[PDB]
Amino acid sequence: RTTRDDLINGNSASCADVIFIYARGSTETGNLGTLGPSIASNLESAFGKDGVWIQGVGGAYRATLGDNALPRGTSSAAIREMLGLFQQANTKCPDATLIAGGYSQGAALAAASIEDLDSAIRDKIAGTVLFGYTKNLQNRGRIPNYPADRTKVFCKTGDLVCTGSLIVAAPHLAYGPDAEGPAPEFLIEKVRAVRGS
């Protein structure tokens, strides 16, 4: 439903070509929340069910409302969890192309993790999509240490978290259509650009 642990459960003897690591929003269920499942089905349609592994950030990432107030928009424990997943992906499947994403607090988490990530593994992340990026204004629409061309931010007009606040307004809950259309198309394009064709 809203939980996928393809990377943790996957056999390294039969690695997928693409590994997608996703962080849900504050308070969301499973490890994929509301938007993750939509991105996943599109990726599965493009690469095949066996061509892509979908991994939500679970474990220590509780997606607590209060953690939004911490320095980087999320907890150090959650950042560690996501760094560990990127590391696990590289260790199990060194030839796999990575892609990432996050919504709300999850977007701040994805940004922090990528910032701290070993540059050699970071280079393998072909593209990252961020929805309702809570650090959009603060980071000037960027993920620290990561190129602009591999970044796609979805921030709606009226979504106050994209404008330096932490107030949740209706536009913050309107990313469903983006997750099922433009977001996966961007990720698929970025995977093909790095892998070639």
From Swiss-Prot:
PROSITE patterns: CUTINASE_1 (PS00155), CUTINASE_2 (PS00931). Optimum temperature is below 30 degrees Celsius. Optimum temperature is 30-40 degrees Celsius. It catalyses: cutin + H2O = cutin monomers. One of its GO terms (cellular component) is extracellular region. May have promising applications in chemical and textile industries as it is capable of hydrolyzing a variety of substrates including soluble esters and insoluble triglycerides. Can hydrolyze and thus modulate the surface properties of synthetic fibers such as the plastic poly(ethylene terephthalate) (PET), or the textile fibers polyamide 6,6, polyester and acrylic. Keywords: Disulfide bond, Glycoprotein, Hydrolase, Secreted, Serine esterase, Signal, Virulence. It comes from the Eukaryota. GO terms for biological process: carbohydrate catabolic process. The active site is at S104 (nucleophile), D159, H172 (proton donor/acceptor). Gene3D superfamilies: alpha/beta hydrolase (3.40.50.1820). Pfam families: Cutinase. It is an enzyme of class 3 (hydrolase). It is found in: Secreted. GO terms for molecular function: cutinase activity. Disulfide bonds join C15-C93, C155-C162. Changing L173A: Increases activity on p-nitrophenyl butyrate and decreases activity on poly(ethylene terephthalate) (PET). Catalyzes the hydrolysis of complex carboxylic polyesters found in the cell wall of plants. Degrades cutin, a macromolecule that forms the structure of the plant cuticle. Allows pathogenic fungi to penetrate through the cuticular barrier into the host plant during the initial stage of fungal infection. This is Cutinase 1. It comes from Fusarium vanettenii (Neocosmospora pisi).
